Design a protein around this ligand. Structure first.
Ligand SMILES: [Zn+2]
Ligand SMILES: [Zn+2]
Ligand SMILES: [Zn+2]
Ligand SMILES: [Zn+2]
Ligand SMILES: [Zn+2]
Ligand SMILES: [Zn+2]
Lengths: 45, 279, 79, 65, 110, 147, 112, 49, 43, 56, 53
């Protein structure tokens, strides 16, 4: 189960596999990849 | 004789080939030992970027026509003649059924996927003395429901039957025997969205109907024997869960079930609503 | 008023934005009346889909030819 | 977008002048030349920057996120 | 480098053009191509007798080109021929064919 | 200066002068032929997959993907795609251990780099899932650039 | 020149077949393995070879007899020059014309 | 020092353009050949010659 | 007499969608449809 | 030894035996013993001559 | 980062925010820090907690 988001409710779906492409609180139909809580070190050079 | 080449290091001979591929400069290099093996690695990608053999298999032919530097005679001879070399192939009855389902899968909007499977299975058998004709239609009816039933979409028989009249019985055998064909050549929920899709409903009644449909089957009430019935009563009782105007009078004339089972389905479900309260 | 036939079978309104990212096509369907009839010869014994038509954006047939500026933000379309 | 931090050429103080700049206009019905002046921007490389910024981000914020 | 070969190296000095005795076309051709079905009908490597058969030049760097051995980078291709039931005009010469006949008696042929 | 060139304040550059963003986006989709051939977004491995790109995958997720915001350089495979291989069909050398699946993943341009911006997932028009990745990189003025 | 240039040979009798390298097999994802316009222009002419074979093996309607020959002599012409004046532009499946051999040499970006 | 002649000087609107160098640079030493004439492939993104 | 076989809808929808997607306009014409040019507003 | 990477380095060492080594992916073998006759693909350095054109 | 700005575009301007620098010499350079790349001898670490509330 992996946290993905929808562009009509902005709710951390956090779903897994074998599921219809949909979101909660709005029948919405697209989802994103929801960036990593893993740090990312910066070369701000 | 197998006329093969096994790629192999001459200065290692250590192992089955443990190398790496240097496409972007065109060589394979002995990953371990460091020596190139081959060179001028041709493009294997930009090759395709320019541009039915699972069905048609191996035969070749072409679609052709008239030119700008031409007259209607050469247009006419290549119109008649490029019909004269189609009898060399039964594939007129191969191609046309495609063209049939090609027309048809379109006509009821079906995606590319349903068609291809519903094409593909049509390659699979395409014939047997067992089939022995069978109308050339009820097979094609079955030739798509299999593809649909395989494209993760599911349709009732009444449905494609109300796309194509097939009397459903010889078809039903034809589909049965078609299934057992691919058995040797080797799920009632799916309808609910499209059902309510015309009903302009929102998903909750559908989802609720799912767990209702989910609960009815497992416990008891083997529920439906033609259980698209219970798929429907699920809709209706799940809109009996709602106040929203969905008269079974509307449901039956729009889902094509006399409301008697709707009452009865809901009836045992007016009894089985009690254990049908998740929210 | 424009829509999509999704593969499952469902159909629904479609917004220009979703068209772009679903690689869809901003079309609306067409419907015409058909008079099927017969004669036997001097004497004679619904509504029909005919295709999907793409629509120029900001045309009356496009959802946006009215929509409010604020809603354009809610429609995620630069005003 | 947002009111660059200090000028390309001079580098004097802008990431403060920005909204001070505004109140002047609305409240004081105040001309620009006068405004930047009592903002303390007597040179003009700066009298470029703020004069010709575009505060776009006040558009993006309209979008629901 | 390409694999060694002992035939002494020279460079072209003359190029004589001309046409084929069809005899020659057969005389060289390693193959009579038959079945427009291109490659192995069982959807494995290649269709023999057919429009690219392994007697000809070979591919995928993994074939070996039956006659002249492996290297795709060395097989220069080897020729197929096909015979024509009915002799056919060669386009490039029609003007000269139409030019020709006027020079000859159609009966004597001289 | 000569012949239409220019001298730029190297400083002003440091104050964002003329700097600009740049947005590449990448596309893919998994499509089937008899469904007996089925493309699949997933993480491929040098343990069981054949013909595998030289760069790294480990920035790939288990779903064949990458979280947005992750830094990437060139030659970092962006989307992990895999294709069915028939054992009997090809026999290209190394097949005797894998017999699993072929790679047709789409790496980042070997020449570009930056930060993943926006990963979305949809079905295409016809029900096949397909993913777009958007790349963001910043572009400071350099010697060549045309003004 | 009787040794190299015979009017006998001005009229095509046996066709050589340039092996794959001239007309290679563009070969993608185990499935997406396309071929060059030449590939077909063999097969069609291979077909137009074998049909008119049988029509003369079996039967002689003696005007359709003419036809596959006008037909065959048509293709082989196209196979050797697609842009011929006062003829059809013999197209490909994709609708676009056939990259005949002469076109491989025509002008800018020909081989030469 | 002073500059023995006086300079023109003002602001002026300037545009930037796509044609950044990092898009226009490449060099090739035995890249990948074509399929057909085994010649070095074309195309800058493709390691062309 | 069935209607849905009678009218092949694709005949139009496929026609336009194509003939937009490329400026091919039949062939017999090209250069009429482009991708839009979203470089900068004025463009 | 400077490898292909720092500028005054080299990419390819050619053995007289028609035989070519990439200097990266052979660092496992490290430093080799070179010999006369062998070829070496250094990077370009100063004062090589190069041919330098502007089309047309 | 939820915000509408691209990250470094923030981080860029976070560069140009002037800082108190009297006692600057009592700080030694980054490179000259044997430290684990920063420490109270070489650098100052600032962080931020901005919320659109
Ligand atoms: Zn939502
Ligand atoms: Zn080795
Ligand atoms: Zn200034
Ligand atoms: Zn050969
Ligand atoms: Zn005579
Ligand atoms: Zn320190």
């Amino acid at each position: 189960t992996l946290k993905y988001i929808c562009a009509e409710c902005s709710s951390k779906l956090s779903l897994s596999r074998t599921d219809a492409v949909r979101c909660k609180d709005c029948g919405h139909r697209i989802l994103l990849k929801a960036r990593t809580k893993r740090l990312v070190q910066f070369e701000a050079r | 004789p197998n006329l093969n080449i096994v790629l192999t290091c001459p200065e290692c001979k250590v192992y089955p080939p443990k190398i790496v591929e240097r496409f972007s400069e065109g060589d394979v290099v002995c990953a371990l030992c460091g020596l190139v093996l081959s060179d001028k690695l041709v493009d294997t990608r930009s090759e395709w970027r320019t541009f039915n053999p699972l069905l048609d298999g191996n035969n070749l032919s072409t679609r052709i026509g008239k030119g700008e530097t031409t007259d209607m005679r050469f247009t006419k001879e290549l119109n008649k003649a490029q019909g004269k070399n189609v009898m060399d192939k039964k594939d007129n009855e191969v191609q046309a059924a495609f063209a049939k389902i090609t027309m048809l899968c379109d006509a009821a909007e079906l995606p590319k996927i349903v068609k291809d499977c519903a094409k593909e299975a049509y390659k699979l058998c395409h014939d047997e003395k067992t089939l022995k004709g069978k109308s050339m239609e009820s097979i094609m009816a079955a030739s798509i429901l299999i593809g649909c039933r395989r494209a993760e979409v599911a349709r009732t028989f009444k449905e494609i039957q109300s796309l194509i009249h097939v009397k459903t019985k010889e078809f039903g055998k034809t589909l049965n025997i078609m299934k057992n064909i691919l058995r040797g050549k080797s799920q009632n929920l799916t309808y609910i969205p499209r059902f309510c899709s015309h009903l302009g409903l929102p998903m909750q009644v559908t989802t609720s109907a799912e767990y209702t449909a989910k609960k009815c089957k497992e416990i008891k009430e083997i529920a439906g024997k033609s259980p698209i019935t219970i798929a429907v009563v699920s809709i209706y009782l799940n809109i009996l869960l709602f106040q929203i105007p969905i008269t079974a009078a509307k449901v039956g004339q729009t889902l094509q079930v006399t409301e008697g089972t709707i009452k009865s389905g809901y009836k045992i479900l007016y009894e089985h609503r009690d254990k049908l309260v998740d929210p | 008023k424009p829509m999509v036939n999704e593969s499952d079978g469902v159909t629904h309104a479609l917004y220009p934005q979703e068209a772009r990212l679903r690689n869809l096509t901003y079309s609306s369907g067409l419907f015409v009346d058909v008079k099927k009839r017969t004669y036997e010869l001097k004497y004679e014994l619904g509504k029909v889909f005919i295709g999907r038509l793409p629509i120029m954006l900001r045309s009356k047939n496009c959802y946006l030819s009215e929509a409010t500026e604020s809603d354009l933000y809610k429609l995620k379309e630069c005003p | 977008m947002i009111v660059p931090v200090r000028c390309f050429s001079c580098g004097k103080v802008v990431g403060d002048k920005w909204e001070s700049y505004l109140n002047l206009l609305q409240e004081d019905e105040l001309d620009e030349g006068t405004a930047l002046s009592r903002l303390g921007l007597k040179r003009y490389c700066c009298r470029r920057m703020i004069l010709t910024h575009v505060d776009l981000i006040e558009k993006f914020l309209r979008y629901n996120p | 480098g390409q694999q060694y070969s002992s035939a002494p190296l020279r460079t072209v000095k003359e190029v004589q053009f001309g046409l084929f005795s069809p005899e020659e076309v057969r005389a060289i051709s390693v193959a009579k191509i038959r079945f427009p079905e291109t490659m192995d009908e069982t959807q494995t490597r290649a269709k023999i007798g057919g429009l690219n058969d392994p007697r000809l030049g070979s591919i995928d760097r993994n074939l070996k080109c039956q006659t002249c051995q492996e290297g795709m980078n060395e097989c220069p291709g080897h020729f197929g021929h096909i015979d024509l039931a009915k002799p056919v005009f060669h386009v490039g010469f029609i003007a000269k064919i139409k030019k020709v006949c006027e020079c000859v008696c159609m009966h004597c042929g001289k | 200066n000569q012949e239409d060139s220019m001298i730029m304040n190297q400083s002003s550059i440091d104050r964002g002068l003329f700097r600009s963003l740049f947005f590449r986006s990448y596309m893919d989709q998994e499509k089937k032929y008899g469904m007996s051939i089925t493309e699949t977004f997933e993480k491929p491995q040098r343990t069981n997959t054949l013909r595998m790109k030289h760069g790294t995958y480990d920035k790939l997720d288990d779903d064949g993907l990458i979280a947005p915001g992750v830094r990437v350089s060139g030659e970092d495979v962006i989307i992990g795609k895999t294709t069915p291989i028939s054992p009997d069909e090809e026999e290209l050398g190394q097949r005797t251990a894998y017999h699993s699946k072929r790679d047709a993943s789409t790496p980042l341009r070997s020449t570009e780099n930056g930060i993943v911006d926006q990963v979305l997932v949809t079905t295409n028009q016809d029900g096949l899932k397909f993913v777009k990745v958007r790349v963001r990189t910043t572009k400071i003025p350099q010697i060549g650039d045309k003004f | 020149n009787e040794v190299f240039s015979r009017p006998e040979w001005m009229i095509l009798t046996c066709l050589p077949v340039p092996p794959p390298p001239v007309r290679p097999s563009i070969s993608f994802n185990e499935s997406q393995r396309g071929e060059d316009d030449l590939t077909f222009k063999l097969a069609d002419i291979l077909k137009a070879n074998i049909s008119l074979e049988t029509l003369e093996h079996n039967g002689a309607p003696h005007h359709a007899i003419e036809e596959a020959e006008s037909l065959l002599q048509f293709h082989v012409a196209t196979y050797m020059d697609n842009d011929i004046a006062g003829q059809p532009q013999a197209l490909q499946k994709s609708g676009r014309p056939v990259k005949s051999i002469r076109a491989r040499l025509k002008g800018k970006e020909g081989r030469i | 020092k002073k500059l023995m002649a006086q300079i023109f000087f003002g602001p002026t609107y300037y545009q930037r353009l796509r044609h950044m160098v990092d898009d226009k640079i490449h060099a090739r030493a035995r890249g990948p050949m074509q399929v057909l004439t085994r010649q070095p492939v074309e195309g800058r993104s493709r390691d062309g010659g | 007499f069935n209607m849905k076989l009678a009218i092949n809808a694709k005949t139009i929808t496929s026609g336009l969608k194509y003939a937009l997607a490329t400026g091919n306009w039949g062939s017999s014409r090209a250069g009429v449809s482009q991708v839009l040019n979203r470089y900068t507003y004025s463009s | 030894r400077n490898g292909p990477n720092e500028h005054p380095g080299a990419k390819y060492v050619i053995r007289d035996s028609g035989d070519r080594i990439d200097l990266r992916y052979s660092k496992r073998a490290g430093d080799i013993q070179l010999q006369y006759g062998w070829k070496v693909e250094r990077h370009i350095m100063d004062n090589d001559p190069v041919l330098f054109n502007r089309q047309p | 980062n939820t915000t509408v700005l691209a990250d470094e575009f923030i981080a860029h301007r976070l560069g140009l925010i002037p800082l108190q620098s009297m006692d600057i010499e009592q700080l030694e350079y980054s490179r000259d820090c044997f430290c684990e790349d920063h420490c109270d001898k070489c650098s100052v670490v600032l962080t931020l907690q901005a919320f659109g509330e």
